Amino acid sequence: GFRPSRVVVVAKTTRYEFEQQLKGSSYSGLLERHHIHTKNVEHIIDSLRNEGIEVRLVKRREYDEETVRWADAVIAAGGDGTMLLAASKVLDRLKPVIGVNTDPERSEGHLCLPVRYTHSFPEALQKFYRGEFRWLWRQRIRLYLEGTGINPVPVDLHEASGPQLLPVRALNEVFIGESLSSRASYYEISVDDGPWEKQKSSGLNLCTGTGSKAWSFNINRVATQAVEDVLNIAKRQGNLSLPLNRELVEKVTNEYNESLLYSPEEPKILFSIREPIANRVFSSSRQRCFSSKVCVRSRCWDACMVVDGGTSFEFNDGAIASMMINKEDELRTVLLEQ
């Protein structure tokens, strides 16, 4: 069983708090969105204090490493974005990090406790107390940086030198690309210490098993129409039998897309070349594959390495990044029944 005496709760900033800091696309829904989150944060904190747990409630600007150190456990109160924020400042594989979905009608909360615990949190505490749960260590990617002209200083997106460790780990993915959305990205890639291979594309995505359902899923999943087309082509071009139906096309589609998801516990990186350009002057290889190690040498003008959509690093011509998975970067999370 597991009973912290000391807990920091990191709560997301709501849209309403943002504007506080009408037209027609806000206010009415926004204030109700704010009341729901606040009602649920209060339920979490009241429930913790009723178990005798000391609690510090902070917003993003006050969530710091000192407070993580003070705490026995971190609770992210918001959505998956709030889990990523919480994980960004936890580097100890023994420190539990737990997510509570505070607006389940608008937050997916895939990294969070099942939705029932949002308004039944004492039930979650008791399940923890009795050990009716399992530890889940989610693998994360660490980033090294070397080369010429490099700038290793992290930028917080929510407002010749040897390899040095960058101060965040990726729980979802590392995205590498030019800052301008229409500017093709140019680099060289070494996978598992293999040969260097020039790529031109709209960026690279390097995700964990946790991240396999996030950005990586939407880069790689095929539409049920595309599957329907591919199958119809296979009839014309060789009468590949079968009866294609509504049911079958969805099925085969779903089987393909599940192949893109893998276990959060497996220490492997799924890397995807995002929208590669082939034609007669460039040539690309595989679109995606698993690996333990990816090294990227920047050839970019004004590009960034973005960790979990939250922390950005400069990555221009001369910079060399290496990504791997290290056991000491595992993020300690919990699994409850729903």
Ligand X SMILES: NC(=O)c1ccc[n+]([C@@H]2O[C@H](COP(=O)([O-])OP(=O)(O)OC[C@H]3O[C@@H](n4cnc5c(N)ncnc54)[C@H](OP(=O)(O)O)[C@@H]3O)[C@@H](O)[C@H]2O)c1
Residue with tokens 């001369």: 318
Task: Single out the residue of 58, 155, 157, 335 in contact with its own copies (rule: CB under 8 A).
Answer: 157
Grouping H, G, I as helix, E, B as strand and the rest as coil, residue 253 is helix
Q: Decide whether 154 or 310 has the Cβ nearer to Ca ion.
A: 310
Q: Which of 102, 201, 210, 212 binds its own copies (CB under 8 A)?
A: 201
Judged by CB under 8 A, the stretch of 28-36, 57-65, 91-99, 249-257 that binds its own copies is: 249-257
Pick from 150, 144, 161: nearest CA to 319: 150
| Closest C-alpha to 15, from 34, 32, 28 | 34
| 147 belongs to the binding site for ligand X (CB under 6 A) | no
| CB-nearer residue toward Ca ion: 55 or 97 | 97
**Coil vs helix vs strand at 306:** strand
Give dist(CA 97, CA 112) in Å, integer. Answer: 10
Question: What is the sign, positive or negative, of the torsion defined by CA atoms of 65, 67, 70, 73?
Answer: negative
202 binds ligand X (CB under 6 A): yes
What is the full DSSP assignment across 58-79?
E-GGG--HHHHHH-SEEEEEES
The two tokens of residue 77 are 């109160």
Sign for the CA dihedral angle at 298, 300, 301, 305 comes to negative
Smallest distance, its own copies to C-beta of residue 321, A = 16
19 binds, among Ca ion, ligand X, its own copies, none (CB under 5 to 8 A by kind): none
Q: Could you tell me what percentage of the chain is helix, strand and coil, using 3-state DSSP and rounding each to the nearest 5?
A: 30, 30, 40
The single residue among 108, 192, 193, 265 that binds its own copies, judged by CB under 8 A, is 108
Question: Which span (75-83, 94-102, 210-218, 259-267) binds Ca ion, by CB under 5 A?
Answer: 75-83
Q: How far apart are the first and last CA of the chain?
A: 19
Interface with ligand X (CB under 6 A)? 79-81, 84, 107-111, 172-173, 182, 184, 201-202, 210-211, 213-215, 218, 275, 277, 279, 281, 308-309
Interface with its own copies (CB under 8 A)? 23, 25, 105-108, 110, 148, 157, 175, 177-183, 201-203, 215, 218-219, 222-223, 225-227, 229-231, 233-234, 236-242, 248, 251-252, 255-256, 259, 275-281, 286-287, 299, 304, 306, 309, 312, 317-318
Interface with Ca ion (CB under 5 A)? 79, 81
